[PDB]
């Protein structure tokens, strides 16, 4: 056939480029970083009404100060999360401190290109890693299967990403509040989702310095959805 | 480096054929004719010494080989494959039997070990099957005299008499008419020489024919005296002269 | 064509296509410039962003107090190679109490990249590196290609549109080599060099990345408002 | 067909096309030569100046093995370095066990067997270099040349790279006109000339000359680079001959 | 640990095991249960070096429970005892052997018979009508040699066991803080809460 | 490199089938028919040797029926050499179990173990599967008389009566027609031979083209006896049932 | 060792070996899982192409992983044994180290993790198996029902079906299963499970297997006659 | 058609890679000849130095494997030297392990077995060489044993290898048909070398100078190669009668 | 028998002030009753405003300090030139020491 670690004539790794196509088929995940915190939101996308939607876990805690959202082949993310959690805890053991969000992200991205003929293929999932540390404050990273990670003020990944990213382009400014960010994630998720957005098929989360990483209750998100509907009807 | 061929080179085709085994059998078909006949008091194995050049000393090339003092082997197909199989067969007779039980293995079990080695070349990674069919004649105390065929697949069958290689189809028909359950060893040798003459084109004498027997114990070939229970090897390779003597009464 | 399936296969004209495709990844990468005098060596790198919300990908990596590089191509491959250099610089210090020579650092990178071009299963590195350093024989600048070829130069540039900066340095050769004991002027020449490779976009405060090493100057990276002085 | 897609595969001719394709990479490289003299050897190489930005005399191509052997090669430069690294390991282990520095014929086979090993499997690529090497041992001077196939012979003169035909013709004249032999200092001068003459095949870009030598009288049987006045003297002699 | 006794009567196996855990100079606990249920009709008591005892017992327990689930079937006491013996016989030639002695009391539901097996840390197995490990047997076997009849009832077995424990409490130097008694019969395993 | 020549023996087709397993089953469909019939008082194993010769030494020959232990036996259909590899492994497993628990191995546990080995060759290793299908005839004190079959996929199932090898479709229909639950060994012997006699590709069914075995509690009191039939004994049972 | 990457991405971002493993599941016999208010029922199809089978000894479709959790499946039978064995070993290992039996979610997460590992490991193909894992957490009376598939994704279901014609029985369950009021009793839950299989099965004879799992390790498999009574009652109500 | 790339069977039962290795054998275009005397075994081989830049002393296809065993090779020099180094190692190991000098026929068998392995194992290619081993064995006397890429080997009364082997083979065959003995009935090795050269001249139809030949001689307890001057003396004797 | 340990003597002293800290140590190095050196530095500046001394067997002391200085260097590389706090350095040193739990660095370390 052909090598798994083969370069294309354009200078790209075939397998890495193909895994990016799998991520485009995944459910939407959006992250927005503010000076009051970082918000992470996801589309759950249940395949059937009999599937209990609260069992869909696409937002995940890595440590008290670091959260993570996923999009693509979500089964591939489990070992990445396990590594991230281990790295975060191990560093605390070695250094009696929290680990930097960037350093955590770098540790996850080191796994990415460890494939060949090590694992047999790249990961088929992209991650939004959001957190806080004392040095660089509130941060949001986009970890890809290429081993590359970009920091973002705001980022959308998954099937509705380019439409959502264009929307984030206009809406984001450096003075956003946490409440404004929450509504903004809900607004853009509602735009790109196939089904009508509610508290059962969409999930919010945030990371603040005080309270740490928190996944929002369905009751709490339902209120923010109702607050969104009214403010859009307000003009 | 490293052997990176850890996958099978012999695989099932859509029709259920194992191609490499079939092709190995085709190589055996091209090989020179060899045969085996079982008598009441012995077994005979024989083949033609197809000399590649008249400058070559064909005595140095042994197609019939001693495996144990009571077991011998002959082949048809690829000579080099046969040679390494004889080496492994001789060694496995010691490692997997004699060093455990203090005696040489019975014919059927040594055959089983050889068969196993050939089967493994049919399934293991990065190897082709052996391109030979063996005929193994031997004797042991509890089974008596026996004659086995071993194919590239690793399958083995016991025979009263048989032939393999070039003119096997004709030779087996010739043996069916002549064989009976009352043959003495000398009668089997006579039939062996008759059968082998049909497949041979050129010279037919003691120097172009290789023939060995599994018969009576040979205390003269033991090399030592002083142990009554040790009576000598039953395997014996017939000399060029001994063959020619029987070609006059042919 | 039929001979580009893996790195272990020469073409009929004696070419290694997988290596050439790896070389292509560098050309797609953002421009970076390297140049030196007799006292100092300077790296200038144009950082690339994904979009307006994203950060600008870092291009320069420190290897030791007296050595470091800038990258163009696959950033993870630069991380692997820079990590290797860090270890080799560190082995030299711990074992021999000796700062690793820039020339010997180049030889080590060449040999590491080479093994990936002759063996089955692996792949060539998809990144080009510009190594600067100050050792016992003064200032140095190296250009690393993932084919294995390493070259000591007065100045150079790699990445997209790097030919413009390389021509400028080829003209300015006699001028910038003489900029001794003046770091700011050597950086100016490097900033002016990388400007010859720009189209549409210009050098902004979070776009530009500069590094310097010299006689009494540890390898230090300048980003953000620290490079506004040179814009 | 398909016999040329994998290393270590015999074509119906009995040829290994992958090794023959490696030769094409060698033929594409710069010119390098070797001259066997009275009590030693002289190595010289053409270094193409791709740009003015190349620092003169810095990108050294000729490599020393042990302290008595010089190695130069044409083709893929990294492949040559890999081969020399192995040569250095081979020489070190020889000296470790046997005390004496590795003889040149002994060293030649070590490289030969290693290069030949890379024509035995499809999991490795052949070397994209022809290596000219040699030096002085207890039995005197020796010059060798080693091809991608692992083939090597002893030589009076050797040449490889893009200007090998030109160089070979020049080497053949020296062999004919000097049956009694050539001195070490003469060989350095002649080496400079031959590289300058062989540069006509690479005449687009200008080049830098690099010479080294081992000689029993001139260098005490140790490998040394030709530097300064002796190098300039050879360059002047070379420039005089082309005009 | 210290004293573990076993006695096989007509229709059941009775295991008695001391409650004391002493490390050095102090008695850290006086209610320790030195036994594990391997299967519904098989019980194993144990005594030996600290840590190893529980580690070994729970390891055996896990293995038998795994077998039970896989085959949906309870192994015979004889089969369980043979598995345990092999583990100890493997263990004695290890880098660091399990220093554990066990009694296995089981009721074979197929044969409708109680069975008592005594196995020491070397992997020395014997089926017995009554058994003990350590210094317990030195006092108790003379009483059992005298009083044991194989047709004894469970109540008679308990009375004979009380006579053993009374002798031990009289003549042994160590205070083993009484025993926990457990009965293994056709209905399974139960603990005698007053002894 | 080596990838070029890799057949990839352990992959799914687009339809979700394992190529090599399917082709191995095709191989087995040309092998001599083997039949197993379970009765209330024993089990019968009957099998047809493939186009034999008059010069084959039958009394010392074994290509179909093999003994795994004193309680369990197997009938083979496929590559004999492949089967002997697995048979020796099975014999060892039974002995391991006996050494560990001091009890004879339950039939299903042995069958599961061999079937798991076969499965492994279809999922990992890159090797070809064993071109063998077994009929397991055995007895233990839990389930009594049992018949199982396993094939190259590593899937196994229990049976009252079953055939493997050639003409299984025809054979299975004939067994399904005449089999009854209250059947006895002597009746099962007759059914097995009658089925082979009808499904055989040969002109006539004779003693020299058959291997035959029975597992009976027809052993003196509560115990089980295996009987691998001799050539003369197969000849007698052929006359008794009225086939020759 | 054999290191060949069998599960790899294609230009359209698909892993065909994982997708072809799902086709093996599509071929497998139908399996269904329905959870009531205080129970979970696992229904399984037995294809009647195989008669003369010995149903005493033939591997049953529903397997106990522990005394409180069960696992059924659709797809390759041989592959399922490997997952079941690993799951059973992990269940005992969890009890040994945590001193508490596995939660149904944990056991599912393990089995799903094994399945995922086989989709990006060299030299191995994915499992051609989807599982339904059901039971009750220790000291908990809330019913649990999870599904896994070759890719390694898993999720919780009020009711779910897998295997051949699962599209049809999922259609049935989606209109007949009410979340606000699930089958309040064992009878109602079994009835709904048998009804759902009767949409696909053929004959309601020995083609339907039912296993009821209740809290506190109360697991029982219904017999032919018990199931046949459900089959009888369903069709007699249908004749109207 | 990958059955032609690696050593697996073609439908005809053939190994094409082995057959193509036999064709590589004649790539050097050199002919070799071996004959046995009473006390000696002589091997001669054509020497061709086409380049004037070559050091002719280093151009050789005859190898001193052990003190007693000599080996001439027909095929490319890299594979020739590969085989030579291995045979030297095997001969030395044999003496260490078993306490006596490795016989010529045993070494031939060992190298033949190694060659057989390359025909069966896929990752190893055959060597494109034919190895002719010569010695005066302490048991068997003058010995010629030849190995090829198929793993085949056999003893010889005399033998020839190369492009024009058939012409040499028939010439030798005809001589032994006359003499009716298995060797050259001659006391001194010098005259056996003269016989070898004379019959190669007759068979090939070409004259030889001292630099056109390469000669190896095996006597009891040593094998040695002749210098150009030793060969010249041999050529002078041939011409003078 | 070979004794891999030795005693190089010396004495060190650390005192924490309100906004400062001192780490002192004598400069004498000895074996048995002989002086090796009258001035052999024992207290080292390890960067990031941390001072360290590993007193006892000097070979193990020098080895430990060398490895910690190395850890500071790699901490900068791996975590974006972040300053290694004294509490984090302390925990890092615990792992360096306990890493050789069964063949210890024979030193009394103070930072
Ligand atoms: Cl050998």
- Structural domains in chain F? 1-244 (3.60.20.10)
3-class secondary structure, G80: helix
Q: Which residue of chain E comes nearest to F109, CA vs CA?
A: E71
In sequence order, the 6+-apart residues with CB closer than 8 A to the CB of C158 are C26, C29, C31, C32, C72, C128, C130, C143
Range of the domain at D129: 1-243
In angstroms, what is the span from residue D103 Cα to ligand 1's centroid? 32
Its CATH class, for the domain covering E1-195, is alpha beta
Task: Tell me the CATH number at D45.
Answer: 3.60.20.10
Lateral strand order in the sheet of G154-156: G63-64, G69-75, G129-135, G144-148, G154-156
Q: Which residue of chain G comes nearest to F143, CA vs CA?
A: G57
Structure tokens at F127: 């090797």
Shortest alpha-carbon distance between residue H106 and chain D (Å): 24
The sign of the dihedral angle between the CA atoms of F74, F77, F78, F79 is positive
In angstroms, what is the span from residue B110 Cα to ligand 1's centroid? 20
On chain C, the residues whose CB falls within 8 A of the CB of A6 are 5-6, 18, 123
| Helices vs. strands in chain E: H and E counts, helices first | 4, 12
Structure tokens at C74: 């696959």
In sequence order, the 6+-apart residues with CB closer than 8 A to the CB of H102 are H66, H69, H90, H91, H94, H95
Q: Do D151 and H77 touch (CB under 8 A)?
A: yes
Task: Tell me the CATH number at G201.
Answer: 3.60.20.10
Nearest to C150 by CA among C181, C113, C110: C110
DSSP letters spanning E51-116 = THHHHHHHHHHHHHHHHHHHHTSPPPHHHHHHHHHHHHHHHTTSSS---EEEEEEEEETTTTEEEE
In sequence order, the 6+-apart residues with CB closer than 8 A to the CB of C141 are C34, C35, C36, C41, C130, C131, C132, C152, C153, C154, C155, C156
CB B25 within 8 A of CB G22: no
3-class secondary structure, G201: coil
Range of the domain at C215: 1-231
Nearest to C34 by CA among D53, D58, D59: D53
DSSP letters spanning chain D = --TTSSTTPPPTTS--HHHHHHHHHHHHS--EEEEE-SSEEEEEEEEE---TTBPTTTS---EEETTTEEEEEEE-HHHHHHHHHHHHHHHHHHHHHHSSPPPHHHHHHHHHHHHHHTTS-TTBPPPSEEEEEEEEETTEEEEEEE-TTS-EEEBSEEEESTTHHHHHHHHHHHHHH-SS---HHHHHHHHHHHHHHHGGGG-SS-EEEEEEEEETTTSTT-EEE--HHHHHHHHHHHHHHH-
F touches G, CB cut-off 8 Å, minimum 3 pairs: yes
Which chains border E (3 or more CB–CB pairs < 8 Å)? F, G
Range of the domain at G49: 1-240
Choice among D1, D30, D31, D160 that is catalytic = D30
In sequence order, the 6+-apart residues with CB closer than 8 A to the CB of F100 are E82, E83, E86
Phi (first) and psi of residue B184, to 5 degrees: -85, 165
For an interface test with F, the pick among G3, G6, G57, G60 (most F C-beta atoms closer than 10 Å) comes out as G57
Task: Tell me the CATH number at B121.
Answer: 3.60.20.10
**B155 inside 8 A of chain F by CB:** yes
Tokens 């529903």 belong to G62
Nearest to H170 by CA among H148, H199, H129: H199
CB D135 within 8 A of CB D214: yes
Task: Tell me the CATH number at C115.
Answer: 3.60.20.10
On chain A, the residues whose CB falls within 8 A of the CB of I80 are 100, 102-103, 135
Shortest alpha-carbon distance between residue A131 and chain I (Å): 15
Max CA separation in chain E (angstroms): 48
Nearest to F189 by CA among F161, F168, F164: F161
On chain F, the residues whose CB falls within 8 A of the CB of G123 are 124-126
Phi (first) and psi of residue F172, to 5 degrees: -65, -35
Tokens 């295997």 belong to G163
Rounded to 5°, the CA angle D172-D176-D180 comes to 125
Alpha-carbon distances of G29 from A45, F46, G61, G150, rounded to whole Å: 28, 32, 10, 16
For an interface test with C, the pick among D119, D125, D161 (most C C-beta atoms closer than 10 Å) comes out as D125
CB I12 within 8 A of CB I110: yes
For an interface test with E, the pick among F102, F105, F222 (most E C-beta atoms closer than 10 Å) comes out as F102
Q: How far apart are CA D32 and CA D30, in angstroms?
A: 7
Q: Tell me, yes or no, if D30 is annotated catalytic.
A: yes
Q: What is the resolution of this structure in A?
A: 2.8
Q: How far apart are CA A20 and CA H87, in angstroms?
A: 55
Q: Do D3 and H53 touch (CB under 8 A)?
A: no
Q: Do H5 and F2 touch (CB under 8 A)?
A: no
In sequence order, the 6+-apart residues with CB closer than 8 A to the CB of H149 are H18, H21, H22, H25, H115, H118, H119, H126, H127, H128, H129, H130
CATH number, domain H1-241: 3.60.20.10
- D vs F, Cβ pairs < 8 A, gives 8
**D86 inside 8 A of chain C by CB:** no
What is the residue extent of each domain of chain A?
Answer: 1-235
What is the Cα B177 distance to its own chain's centre? 22
Residue A143 CA neighbour count, 13 Å, CB half: 30
In angstroms, what is the span from residue H147 Cα to ligand 1's centroid? 14
On chain C, the residues whose CB falls within 8 A of the CB of F1 are 6, 8, 120-121
Q: How far apart are CA H7 and CA A34, in angstroms?
A: 66
In sequence order, the 6+-apart residues with CB closer than 8 A to the CB of G94 are G100, G101, G102, G106
For an interface test with H, the pick among B128, B151, B164 (most H C-beta atoms closer than 10 Å) comes out as B128
CB D144 within 8 A of CB D106: no
Beta strand D157-160 with H41-46: parallel, antiparallel or unpaired? unpaired
Nearest to F1 by CA among H20, H5, G15: H5
Q: How far apart are CA F115 and CA F157, in angstroms?
A: 10
Structure tokens at A182: 């929450």
3-class secondary structure, F145: strand
CB E38 within 8 A of CB E80: yes
Lateral strand order in the sheet of B34-38: B161-164, B34-38, B43-48, B209-214, B235-237
CB A120 within 8 A of CB A80: no
I touches F, CB cut-off 8 Å, minimum 3 pairs: no
Nearest to C56 by CA among C200, C209, C194, C226: C209
- From chain C residues 130-189, the ones with a CB under 8 A of any chain D CB are 147-149, 151-156, 166, 169-170, 173
- Helix (H) or strand (E) run with residue G147 in it: strand G144-148
Q: How far apart are CA D143 and CA D135, in angstroms?
A: 7
**B129 inside 8 A of chain H by CB:** yes
On chain D, the residues whose CB falls within 8 A of the CB of C118 are 79, 82, 118, 124-125
Nearest to H86 by CA among B87, D120, D8, D13: D120
Q: Do H154 and B24 touch (CB under 8 A)?
A: no
H touches G, CB cut-off 8 Å, minimum 3 pairs: no
- Number of structural domains (chain C) is 1
Q: Do C8 and F1 touch (CB under 8 A)?
A: yes
In angstroms, what is the span from residue B82 Cα to ligand 1's centroid? 13
Q: Is A163 buried (19+), middle (13-18) or exposed (0-12) by CB count in 10 A? A: middle
On chain F, the residues whose CB falls within 8 A of the CB of C6 are 1
Beta strands in B40-104, from DSSP E residues, in sequence order: 43-48, 56-57, 65-68, 71-77
Structure tokens at C220: 């230090």
3-class secondary structure, H75: coil
Q: Which residue of chain E comes nearest to G84, CA vs CA?
A: E70
In angstroms, what is the span from residue B80 Cα to ligand 1's centroid? 11
CATH number, domain A1-235: 3.60.20.10
E126 forms beta bridges with: E118
- From chain C residues 187-216, the ones with a CB under 8 A of any chain I CB are none
- Number of structural domains (chain D) is 1
Structure tokens at C71: 């990258």
């Amino acid at each position: 056939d052909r090598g798994v670690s083969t370069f294309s004539p354009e200078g790209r790794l075939f397998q890495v480029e193909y895994s990016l196509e799998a991520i485009k088929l995944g459910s939407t995940a959006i992250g927005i970083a503010t000076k009051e915190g970082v918000v992470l939101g996801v589309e759950k996308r249940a395949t059937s009404p009999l599937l209990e939607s609260d069992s869909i876990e696409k937002i995940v805690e890595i440590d008290r100060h670091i959260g993570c959202a996923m999009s693509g082949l979500t089964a591939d993310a489990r070992s990445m999360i396990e590594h991230a959690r281990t790295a975060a805890v191990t560093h605390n053991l070695y250094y009696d401190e929290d680990i930097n969000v960037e350093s955590l992200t770098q540790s996850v991205c080191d796994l990415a290109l460890r494939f060949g003929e090590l694992m047999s293929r790249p990961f088929g999932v992209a991650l939004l890693i959001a957190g806080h540390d004392a040095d660089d404050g509130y941060q949001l990273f986009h970890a890809e299967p290429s081993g590359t990670f970009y920091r973002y003020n705001a980022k959308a990944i998954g099937s509705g990403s380019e439409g959502a990213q264009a929307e984030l382009l206009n809406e984001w400014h450096s003075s956003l509040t946490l409440k404004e960010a929450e509504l903004l994630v809900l607004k853009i998720l509602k735009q790109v989702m196939e089904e009508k957005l509610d508290e059962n098929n969409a999930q919010l989360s945030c990371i603040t310095k005080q309270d740490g990483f928190k996944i929002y209750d369905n009751e709490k998100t339902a209120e923010l959805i109702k607050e969104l509907k009214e403010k859009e009807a307000a003009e | 480096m490293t052997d990176r061929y850890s996958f099978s080179l012999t695989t099932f085709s859509p029709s259920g054929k194992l191609g490499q085994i079939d092709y190995a059998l085709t190589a055996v078909k091209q090989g020179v004719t060899s045969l085996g006949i079982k008598a009441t008091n012995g077994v005979v194995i024989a083949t033609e010494k197809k000399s590649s050049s008249p400058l070559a000393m064909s005595e140095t090339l042994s197609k019939v080989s001693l495996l144990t003092p009571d077991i011998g082997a002959v082949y048809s197909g690829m000579g080099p494959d046969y040679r390494v199989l004889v080496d492994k067969s001789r060694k496995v007779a010691h490692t997997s039997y004699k060093r455990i039980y203090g005696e040489y293995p019975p014919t059927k079990l040594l055959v089983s070990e050889v068969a196993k080695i050939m089967q493994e070349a049919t399934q293991s990674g990065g190897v082709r099957p052996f391109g030979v069919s063996l005929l193994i004649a031997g004797h042991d105390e509890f089974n008596g005299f026996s004659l086995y065929q071993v194919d590239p697949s690793g399958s083995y069958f016991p025979w009263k008499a048989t032939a393999i290689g070039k003119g096997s189809v004709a030779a087996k028909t010739f043996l069916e008419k002549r064989w009976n359950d009352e043959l003495e060893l000398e009668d089997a040798i006579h039939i062996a020489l008759l059968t082998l003459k049909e497949s041979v084109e050129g010279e037919f004498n003691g120097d172009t024919i290789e023939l060995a027997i599994i018969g009576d114990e040979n205390p003269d070939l033991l090399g030592y005296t002083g142990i009554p229970t040790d009576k000598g090897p039953r395997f014996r390779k017939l000399t060029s002269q001994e063959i020619n003597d029987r070609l006059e009464a042919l | 064509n039929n001979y580009d399936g893996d790195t272990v296969t020469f073409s009929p004209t004696g070419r290694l296509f997988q290596v050439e495709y790896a070389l292509e990844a560098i050309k797609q990468g953002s421009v970076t410039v390297g140049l030196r005098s007799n006292t100092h060596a300077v790296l200038v790198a144009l950082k690339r962003n994904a979009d307006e919300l994203s950060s600008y990908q870092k291009k320069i990596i420190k290897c030791d107090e007296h050595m470091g590089l800038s990258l163009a191509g696959l950033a993870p491959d630069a991380r692997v190679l820079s990590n290797y250099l860090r270890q080799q610089c560190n082995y030299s210090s711990l074992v021999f109490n000796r700062k690793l020579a820039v020339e010997r650092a180049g030889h080590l990178l060449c040999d590491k990249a080479q093994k990936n071009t002759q063996s089955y299963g692996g792949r060539p590195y998809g990144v080009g590196l510009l190594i600067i350093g100050y050792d016992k024989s003064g200032a140095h600048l190296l250009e690393f290609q993932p084919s294995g070829n390493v070259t000591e130069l007065y100045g150079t540039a790699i990445g997209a549109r790097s030919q413009g900066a390389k021509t400028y340095l080829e003209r300015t050769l006699d001028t910038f080599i003489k900029i001794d004991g003046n770091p700011d002027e050597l950086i100016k020449a490097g900033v002016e060099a990388i400007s010859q490779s720009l189209r549409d976009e210009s050098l902004t405060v979070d776009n530009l990345s500069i590094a310097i090493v010299g006689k009494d100057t540890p390898f230090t990276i300048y980003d953000g408002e620290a490079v506004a002085k040179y814009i | 067909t398909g016999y040329d897609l994998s290393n270590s595969v015999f074509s119906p001719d009995g040829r290994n096309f992958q090794v023959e394709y490696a030769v094409k990479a060698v033929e594409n490289g710069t010119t390098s030569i070797g001259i066997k003299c009275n009590d030693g050897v002289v190595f010289a190489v053409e270094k193409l100046i791709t740009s003015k930005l190349l620092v003169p005399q810095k990108n050294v191509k000729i490599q020393v093995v042990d302290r008595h052997i010089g190695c130069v090669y044409s083709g893929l430069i990294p492949d040559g370095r890999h081969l020399v690294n192995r040569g250095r390991e081979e020489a070190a282990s020889f000296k470790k066990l046997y005390k004496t520095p590795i003889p040149i014929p002994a060293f030649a086979d070590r490289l030969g067997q290693y290069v030949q090993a890379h024509t035995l499997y499809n999991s490795v690529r052949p070397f994209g270099v022809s290596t000219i090497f040699g030096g002085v041992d207890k039995n005197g001077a020796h010059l060798y040349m080693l091809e991608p196939s692992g083939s090597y012979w002893g030589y009076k003169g050797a040449a490889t790279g893009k200007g090998r035909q030109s160089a070979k013709a020049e080497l053949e004249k020296l062999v004919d006109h000097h049956p009694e032999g050539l001195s070490a200092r003469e060989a350095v001068k002649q080496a400079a000339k031959i590289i300058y003459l062989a540069h006509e095949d690479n005449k687009e870009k200008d080049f830098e000359l690099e010479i080294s030598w081992c000689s029993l009288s001139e260098t005490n049987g140790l490998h040394k680079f030709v530097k300064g006045d002796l190098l300039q003297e050879a360059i002047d002699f070379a420039q005089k001959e082309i005009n | 640990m210290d004293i573990i006794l076993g006695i096989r009567v007509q229709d059941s196996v009775i295991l008695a095991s001391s409650k004391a855990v002493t490390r050095g100079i102090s008695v850290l606990k006086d209610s320790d249960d030195k036994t594990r249920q391997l299967s519904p009709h098989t019980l194993m008591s144990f005594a030996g070096e600290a840590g190893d005892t529980v580690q070994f017992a729970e390891y055996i327990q896990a293995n038998i429970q795994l077998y039970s689930i896989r085959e949906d079937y309870e192994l015979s006491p004889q089969a369980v005892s043979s598995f345990v013996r092999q583990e100890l016989a493997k263990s004695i030639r290890s880098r660091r052997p399990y220093q554990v002695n066990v009694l296995i009391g089981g009721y074979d539901k197929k044969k409708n018979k109680p069975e008592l097996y005594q196995i020491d840390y070397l992997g020395t197995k014997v089926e017995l009508p009554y058994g003990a490990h350590g210094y317990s047997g030195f006092y108790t076997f003379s009483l059992l040699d005298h009083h044991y009849r194989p047709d004894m009832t469970t109540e008679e077995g308990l009375d004979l066991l009380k006579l053993c424990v009374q002798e031990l409490e009289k003549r042994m130097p160590m205070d083993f803080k009484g025993v926990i008694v457990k009965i293994v019969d056709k209905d399974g395993i139960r603990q005698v809460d007053d002894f | 490199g080596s990838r070029r020549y890799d057949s990839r023996t352990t992959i799914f087709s687009p339809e979700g089938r394992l190529y090599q397993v399917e082709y191995a089953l095709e191989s087995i469909s040309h092998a001599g028919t083997a039949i197993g019939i379970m009765a209330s008082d024993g089990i019968v194993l009957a099998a047809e040797r493939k186009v034999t010769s008059t010069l084959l030494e039958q009394d010392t020959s074994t290509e179909k029926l093999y003994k795994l232990n004193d309680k369990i036996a197997v009938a083979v259909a496929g590559l004999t050499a492949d089967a002997e590899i697995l048979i020796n492994t099975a014999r060892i497993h039974a002995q391991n179990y006996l050494k560990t628990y001091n009890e004879d191995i339950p039939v299903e546990i042995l069958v599961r173990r061999l079937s798991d080995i076969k499965q492994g060759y279809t999922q990992h290793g890159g090797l070809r599967p064993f071109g063998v299908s077994f009929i397991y005839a055995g007895y233990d004190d839990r389930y009594g008389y049992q018949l199982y079959t396993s094939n190259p996929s590593g899937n196994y199932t229990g049976w009252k009566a079953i055939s493997v090898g050639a003409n299984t479709s025809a054979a299975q229909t004939l067994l399904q027609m005449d089999y009854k639950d209250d059947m006895k060994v002597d009746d099962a012997i007759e059914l097995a031979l009658k089925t082979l006699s009808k499904t055989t590709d040969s002109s006539a069914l004779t003693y020299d083209r058959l291997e035959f075995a029975t597992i009976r509690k027809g052993a003196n009191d509560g115990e089980v006896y295996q009987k691998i039939f001799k050539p003369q004994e197969i000849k007698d049972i052929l006359v008794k049932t009225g086939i020759t | 060792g054999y290191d060949r990457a069998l599960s790899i991405f294609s230009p359209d971002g698909h892993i065909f070996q994982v997708e072809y493993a799902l086709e093996a599941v599509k071929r497998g016999t139908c399996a269904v899982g329905v959870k009531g208010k205080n129970c979970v029922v696992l229904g399984c199809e037995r294809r009647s192409t195989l008669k003369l089978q010995d149903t005493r000894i033939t591997p049953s479709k529903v397997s106990k992983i522990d005394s409180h959790v069960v696992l059924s499946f659709s797809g390759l039978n041989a592959d399922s044994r490997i997952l079941i064995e690993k799951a059973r070993v992990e269940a005992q290992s969890h009890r040994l180290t945590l001193e508490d039996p596995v939660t149904v979610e944990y056991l599912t997460r393990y089995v799903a993790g094994v399945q995922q590992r086989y989709t990006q490991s060299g030299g191995v193909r994915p499992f051609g198996v989807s599982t339904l894992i059901a039971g009750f957490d220790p000291r908990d009376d809330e019913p649990k029902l999870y599904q896994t598939e070759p890719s390694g994704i898993y999720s919780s279901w009020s009711a779910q079906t897998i295997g051949r014609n699962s599209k049809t029985v999922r259609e049935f369950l989606e209109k007949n299963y009410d979340r606000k009021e699930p089958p309040a009793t064992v009878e109602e839950c079994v009835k709904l499970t048998v009804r759902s299989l009767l949409e696909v099965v053929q004959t309601g004879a020995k083609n339907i297997e039912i296993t009821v799992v209740k809290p506190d390790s109360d697991i029982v498999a219904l017999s032919s006659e018990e199931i046949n009574q459900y089959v009888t009652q369903i069709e007699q109500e249908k004749q109207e | 058609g990958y059955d032609r790339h690696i050593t697996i069977f073609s439908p005809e039962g053939r190994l094409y890679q082995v057959e193509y290795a036999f064709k590589a054998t004649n790539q050097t275009n050199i002919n070799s000849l071996a004959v046995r005397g009473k006390d000696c075994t002589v091997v001669i081989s054509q020497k061709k130095v086409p380049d004037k830049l070559l050091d002719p002393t280093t151009v050789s296809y005859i190898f001193c494997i052990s003190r007693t065993i000599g080996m001439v090779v027909n095929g490319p020099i890299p594979d020739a030297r590969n085989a030579a180094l291995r045979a030297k190692a095997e001969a030395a190991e044999f003496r260490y392990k078993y306490g006596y000098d490795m016989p010529c026929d045993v070494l031939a068998k060992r190298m033949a077995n190694l060659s057989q392995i390359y025909t069966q194992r896929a990752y190893m290619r055959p060597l494109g060489v034919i190895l002719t081993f010569v010695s005066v064995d302490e048991e068997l006397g003058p010995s010629i044993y030849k190995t090829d890429p198929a793993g085949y080997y056999v003893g010889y009364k005399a033998t020839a290898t190369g492009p024009k082997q058939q012409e040499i083979t028939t010439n030798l065959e005809n001589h032994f048909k006359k003499s009716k003995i298995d060797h050259i009935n001659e006391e001194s090795w010098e005259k056996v070398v003269e016989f070898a050269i004379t019959h190669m001249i007759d068979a090939l139809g070409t004259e030889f100078s001292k630099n056109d030949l390469e000669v190896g001689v095996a006597t009891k307890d040593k094998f040695f190669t002749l210098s150009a001057e030793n060969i010249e003396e041999r050529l002078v004797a041939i011409a003078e009668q | 028998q070979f004794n891999p340990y030795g005693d190089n003597g010396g004495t060190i002293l650390g005192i924490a002030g309100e906004d400062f800290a001192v780490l002192a140590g004598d400069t004498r190095n000895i074996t048995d009753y002989s002086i090796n050196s009258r001035y052999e530095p024992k207290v080292f500046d390890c960067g990031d405003n941390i001072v360290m001394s590993a007193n006892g067997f000097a070979a193990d002391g020098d080895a430990l300090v060398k490895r910690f200085k190395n850890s500071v260097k790699w901490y900068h590389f791996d975590h974006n030139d972040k300053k290694l706090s004294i509490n984090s350095a302390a925990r890092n040193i615990q792992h360096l020491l306990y890493g050789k739990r069964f063949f210890p660095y024979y030193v009394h370390t103070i930072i």
